[PDB]
Amino acid sequence: TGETLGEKWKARLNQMSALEFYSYKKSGITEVCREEARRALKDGVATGGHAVSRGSAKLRWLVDRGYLQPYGKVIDLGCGRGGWSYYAATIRKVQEVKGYTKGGPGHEEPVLVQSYGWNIVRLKSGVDVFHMAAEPCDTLLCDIGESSSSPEVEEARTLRVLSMVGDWLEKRPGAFCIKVLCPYTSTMMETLERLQRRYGGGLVRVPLSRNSTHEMYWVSGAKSNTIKSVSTTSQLLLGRMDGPRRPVKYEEDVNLGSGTR
Ligand SMILES: C[S@+](CC[C@H](N)C(=O)[O-])C[C@H]1O[C@@H](n2cnc3c(N)ncnc32)[C@H](O)[C@@H]1O
Ligand SMILES: [Cl-]
Ligand SMILES: [Cl-]
């Protein structure tokens, strides 16, 4: 034994041919079509309302359902191109958005557009948040955690992120949304129970996530049980391996409009 449902999922995923993998990875998931956004942004459209990444749709999914309620000064850790920061800036109660990402050679760089509220956004590349000192904020967002074929690596990278965000959470933001790349190992589930006892919130699987990642979002507006919410997600991803391939559900891409606040 000792294999976790998610660890069993990850092995199977590892044992899957390329062929099994790419019909699996989107089997039955929710998705936005980026074709129009990607073309407009390539051409230089800044006021067409496009999201700079699929990230805006994911945060929209959570905010549309109250899984979190951004407000005040938003900090966006690992902001990449900025999908979460620009989405944050359209929300009425939000007043300031500060995004930080590493950028450079292998890493997404911030994209400058003029979606609604763009003028309260500042994205800063060249920042390794692991060496950034924590600062107060009202809404704490973190979308760091890069996929790996090894679950030991994914655990390691998730633990590293979670230790870092502890210092930010100790400043007591009222709202938060933290990517947990690997929630599925025994160490992670225990760690996550402990964090939830101290800081509240709970885990949510965003259905725009692909079947090839077990990521879940630790959000201030959930009250869910760690073991049940993570195990439920492992069985979901296991069960989409055994059935025949399901179609993708598209939602509309986000229209972030345009204009200053
Ligand atoms: C792919 S994402 C950004 C997704 C974003 N939420 C959106 O909607 O566009 C996570 C980002 O974290 C950056 N990152 C990874 N490690 C980092 C670190 N130690 N410090 C700062 N940024 C990091 C990656 O380059 C990556 O672009
Ligand atoms: Cl990472
Ligand atoms: Cl990452």
Author numbering: 4 to 264
Text from the published report:
The MTase domain is highly conserved in flaviviruses and is responsible for methylation of the 5′-cap of the viral genomic RNA. In flaviviruses, the NS5 MTase domain performs both N-7 and 2′ -O methylations, using S-adenosyl-l-methionine (SAM) as a methyl donor and generating two S-adenosyl-l-homocysteine (SAH) molecules as reaction by-products. ZIKV MTase is composed of three sub-domains: the major MTase core (residues 54–223) contains a Rossmann fold with seven, mixed, β-strands (β1 to β7) surrounded by two sets of α-helices (αA, αX and αD, αE) on each side. The MTase core provides the binding pocket for the methyl donor SAM and after the methylation step, it houses the by-product SAH.
